[PDB]
């Protein structure tokens, strides 16, 4: 329920289905612009897979 990417309560919770973690989609696309990799599996390419935990 915390970004793998620093750990902040995120302000859009945003998941990629490799890491499975929910992050911050701000901090995601940080890491994601860096080397596109995903947090925890380091799977090339994150938000182009985004899932973004929509309050709907």
Same mark, same amino acid.
């Given at each position: ?5 620093? #750990?902040? /309560? &995120?302000? $859009? &919770? /945003?998941? !990629?289905? =490799? !890491? $499975? @973690? %929910?992050? *911050? =989609?701000?901090?995601? *696309?940080?890491?994601? =612009?860096? @080397? #596109?990799?995903? &947090?925890? @599996?380091? *799977? &090339?390419?994150? %938000?182009?897979? %985004? /899932? *973004? %935990? /929509?309050?709907?």
């Amino acid at each position: 329920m915390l970004c793998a990417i620093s #750990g902040k /309560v &995120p302000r $859009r &919770p /945003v998941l !990629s289905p =490799k !890491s $499975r @973690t %929910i992050f *911050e =989609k701000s901090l995601l *696309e940080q890491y994601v =612009k860096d @080397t #596109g990799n995903d &947090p925890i @599996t380091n *799977e &090339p390419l994150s %938000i182009e897979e %985004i /899932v *973004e %935990i /929509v309050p709907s």
